[PDB]
Write a protein that binds this ligand. Structure first.
Ligand SMILES: *[C@@H]1O[C@H](CO)[C@@H](O)[C@H](O)[C@H]1NC(C)=O
Ligand SMILES: *[C@@H]1O[C@H](CO)[C@@H](O)[C@H](O)[C@H]1NC(C)=O
Ligand SMILES: *[C@@H]1O[C@H](CO)[C@@H](O)[C@H](O)[C@H]1NC(C)=O
Ligand SMILES: *[C@@H]1O[C@H](CO)[C@@H](O)[C@H](O)[C@H]1NC(C)=O
Ligand SMILES: *[C@@H]1O[C@H](CO)[C@@H](O)[C@H](O)[C@H]1NC(C)=O
Length: 639
């Protein structure tokens, strides 16, 4: 595991507080609980000691109590991911209104270990506060956390690595990787929303009132499942997978946790063929977009797993699911959406650009799965795809604004649909894609890229899709600059975790998120904001899987302003790696790339002149940086 120094995952599953932030009251030696083999912090009466673990973590709190003056003594534990919500009186929020209660332990009953329930596992918290409710003098021998995230993983045994000359990019990579494994949970501790239906937005739980909190629900079978957010929801969401899967793939290869989540959604497919908006405990809302995002997960899993048997097991369910979505396509050749529910965007309906771009992407990915199982293509899927591309550009493209309309009925040009159009090749030219890229970077604010479809929100979900779209319009600089702007804020703003990545915020730097009135409920660990991890491995390093487990590949690095990149990730067939070092001229003075043997791929080095030489003696001369159909192995650029 190269560059393991950048890995933010814990080396142990039993963690002791790293530093002491704030001590209110009288505690004689609070920093004694900072050590692994010590501890006698004596809380003299009502007091509070805030701790900092230095990173977002998850687990079950355990207190060893040595001395208590009173038998009615209590020790409370609170948790928060952000510094904004550090309080002795309450935790963060997992409900649509109100901060969560402190975990209370009756430490006066006797000396000994006091461990929390598995239902009171906290899914994500960087700062932990211990508070005393009584006049008792209580000795705390030890406070430790049992790290519960990524249960079936070796937390730091990374299958992938990324290093460049920009340390912010290197830190964003390992942050998103760690963001994903912290929302990778034991399915027994799912649904952090126990009061869905009970507590709502207009419920105004306030001031001294705190809220009960537990997890409970076995949202999936198996040992481990990837969820949307570590602290809150803790559910399986289809749309979040189109970012987290590949980011998980290039870091830990925990495709087991992904398969766990995809099979849970597939098992809940309706009679119609409609895949669900979320996993079982959540409300039965109809989403055309998220239904296709689950079909994207079937394609994405076969691409990275290589498991043709898994594909055949779910090929019929995939085909029935596509059928349900093709039903909304009308005479215009576009799909008319009558279901509004999406990620947060408000205008989903009619001939939406995002929906039709996702359907086009799904239809073309369905053709390769057809070729995988049946060794042919579907002609019906080809015409519907061609019709979407024709009608989207005829009815929704505006050449003065350089962007697609959300529908024919509006002046709004959305971030999701325009980033998805380049991702789906719904565009007719690289220049049309380059025009969208320029027009989306036009709207960038001081804290990130805005989504006008979702009020004042800065969505890292769509931002990651926009990063891939910038690269695909062959504008690598704008993509890197969005990461440095948006994710540098997400990683280095003092109200963040410096380890995991937030679910969303707003154009004004405030960490308020549009769908929530409870800003403390926002998740600083969401896997759908881990896109830069996969994109830096795919587009900057150039390591593209174009076939199952990399059976076919494309080595096309787009380094931008970077001078040195050393990156690699692992599939079933082998390791995909590269170590290239450019110059002030922007020309590769050193390039080595590694692909598994018994595989075939193409190489685009962008005008770079030289010969690619294999370790087994093969030599291929480049034509405008072009190499076509070269066999797998480790190749060196020789000038
Ligand atoms: C402190 O809090 C615990 C748990 O909420 C409660 O049972 C106890 O009565 C409280 N004691 C005082 C002195 O407030
Ligand atoms: C969830 O925990 C609550 C206790 O807070 C209990 O009422 C319920 O039975 C639990 N559900 C499951 C599935 O364990
Ligand atoms: C078109 O998009 C706008 C903005 O997204 C939305 O408000 C409007 O309802 C949409 N129209 C239809 C017919 O869906
Ligand atoms: C994208 O579309 C253009 C025409 O609009 C086509 O020439 C090109 O081959 C397409 N690219 C891919 C990867 O399908
Ligand atoms: C954030 O993390 C980096 C390492 O990833 C570290 O160098 C830096 O000091 C940290 N900053 C804060 C404020 O914790």
């Amino acid at each position: 595991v190269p560059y393991n120094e950048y890995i933010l995952a814990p080396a142990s599953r039993h963690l002791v507080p790293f530093e002491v932030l704030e001590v209110n009251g009288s505690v004689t030696d609070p920093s004694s609980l900072t050590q692994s083999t010590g501890g006698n912090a004596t809380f003299n009466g009502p007091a509070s000691v805030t701790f900092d673990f230095g990173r977002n973590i998850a687990g079950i709190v355990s207190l060893d109590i040595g001395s208590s003056s009173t038998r009615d003594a209590f020790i409370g534990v609170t948790f928060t991911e952000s510094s904004l919500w550090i309080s002795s009186q309450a935790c963060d929020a997992t409900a649509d209104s109100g901060l969560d209660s402190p975990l209370w332990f009756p430490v006066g009953r006797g000396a000994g270990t006091y461990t929390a329930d598995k239902k009171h596992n906290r899914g994500a918290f960087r700062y932990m506060t211990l508070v005393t409710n009584t006049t008792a003098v209580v000795s705390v021998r030890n406070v430790q956390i049992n790290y519960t995230a990524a249960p079936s993983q070796d937390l730091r045994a990374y299958t992938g690595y990324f290093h460049s000359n920009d340390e912010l990019l290197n830190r964003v990579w390992y942050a998103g990787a760690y963001t994903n494994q912290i929302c990778t949970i034991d399915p027994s501790t799912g649904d952090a929303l126990p009061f869905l239906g009970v507590i709502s937005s207009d419920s105004n739980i306030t001031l001294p009132e705190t809220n009960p909190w537990y997890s409970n629900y076995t949202i999936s079978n198996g040992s481990s499942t990837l969820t949307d957010g570590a602290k809150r929801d803790r559910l399986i969401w289809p749309g979040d997978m189109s970012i987290a899967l590949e980011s998980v793939s290039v870091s830990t290869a925990d495709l087991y946790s992904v398969r766990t989540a995809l099979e849970t959604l597939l098992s809940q497919q309706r009679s119609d063929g409609r895949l669900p908006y979320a996993s079982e405990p959540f409300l039965d809302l109809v989403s055309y977009t998220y239904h296709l995002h689950s079909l994207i997960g079937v394609s994405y899993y076969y691409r990275h797993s290589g498991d043709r048997a898994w594909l055949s097991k779910y090929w019929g369910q995939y085909q029935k699911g596509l059928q349900w979505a093709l039903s909304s396509v009308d005479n215009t050749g576009l799909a008319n959406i009558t279901a509004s529910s999406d990620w947060l965007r408000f205008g989903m309906g009619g001939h939406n650009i995002e929906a039709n771009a996702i359907l086009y992407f799904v239809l073309n990915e369905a053709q390769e799965l057809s070729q995988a199982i049946n060794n042919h293509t579907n002609a019906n899927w080809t015409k519907i795809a061609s019709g979407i591309k024709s009608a989207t550009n005829k009815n929704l493209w505006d050449a003065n604004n350089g962007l697609y309309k959300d529908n024919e009925t509006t002046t709004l040009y959305p971030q999701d649909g325009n980033a998805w159009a380049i991702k789906a090749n719904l565009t007719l030219s690289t220049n049309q894609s380059s025009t969208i890229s320029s027009a989306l970077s036009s709207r960038w604010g001081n804290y990130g890229a805005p989504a006008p479809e979702a009020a004042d929100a800065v969505s890292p979900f769509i931002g990651g899709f926009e990063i891939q779209a910038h690269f695909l319009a062959n504008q690598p600089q704008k993509a890197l600059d969005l990461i440095r702007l948006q994710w540098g804020f997400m990683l280095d703003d003092p109200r963040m975790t410096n380890s995991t990545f937030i679910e969303g915020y707003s154009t004004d730097g405030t960490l308020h998120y549009a769908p929530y009135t409870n800003d403390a409920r926002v998740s600083h660990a969401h896997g759908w904001s881990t896109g830069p991890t996969a994109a830096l491995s795919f587009f900057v390093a150039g390591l593209h899987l174009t076939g199952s487990a990399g059976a076919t590949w494309r080595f096309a690095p787009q380094p931008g302003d970077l001078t040195s990149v050393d990156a690699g990730y692992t599939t079933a067939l082998g390791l995909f790696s590269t170590t290239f070092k450019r110059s002030e001229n922007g020309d590769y003075q050193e390039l080595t790339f590694t692909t598994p043997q018994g595989t075939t791929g193409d190489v685009d080095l962008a005008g770079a002149e030289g010969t690619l030489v294999s370790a087994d003696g093969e030599r291929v001369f480049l034509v405008k940086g072009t190499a076509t159909g070269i066999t797998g192995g480790s190749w060196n650029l020789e000038v």
